[PDB]
């Protein structure tokens, strides 16, 4: 698809079988999730920006499908008011930006 | 231009007659840069962050120019950890996400 940025480039994505709006952000390095429940263990992180920092937790090798592409790679699970797709996970799914 | 995001989207900008380098981040509203002095009016702003808001300066209407391509908006000034070109002109250089 082509994304506009006249609206914040949100789109649905689905990890296990739960559907969830995520935008797809070009500035971040890494992929972070709102607080969910994960299997398996997992290592402390702190990631910052603009105000700060926050604990995250780092799952390695989850699957996300990006609309209908299946991307599998590091996520960070914490306390984020909106799920953000990285760089990590945008590049497997073949995204560019043009201009 | 087509942009891959295996590293980061650092660009050069032109702004108040200075190089600079900065992030085209599709998931930022806003244009954002380090302490600068730019020319004219300017207005206190706060702007989410993490943890909180953030003081910033507002300035309106400035010129950039971000590979080539002109634009003239809003750019604020403060504590960012990189200078982000968000999608306020990110909108007017006509940019969009493409998988
Ligand atoms: C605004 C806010 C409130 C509370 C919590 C969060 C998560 C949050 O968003 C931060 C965020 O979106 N992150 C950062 C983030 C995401 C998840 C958890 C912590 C931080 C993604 C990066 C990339 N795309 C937009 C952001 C660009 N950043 C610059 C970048 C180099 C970090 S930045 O420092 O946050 C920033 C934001 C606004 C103005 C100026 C600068
Ligand atoms: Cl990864
Ligand atoms: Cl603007």
Redesign the pocket.
Known sequence: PQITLWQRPLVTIKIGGQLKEALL?T??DDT?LEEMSLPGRWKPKM?????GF?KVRQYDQILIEICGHKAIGTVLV?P???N?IGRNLLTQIGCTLNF
């Not at 990631?47 to 105000?51: T, V």
């Open positions: 952000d500035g971040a972070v990631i910052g920006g603009i105000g926050i914490g984020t008011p909106v953000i």
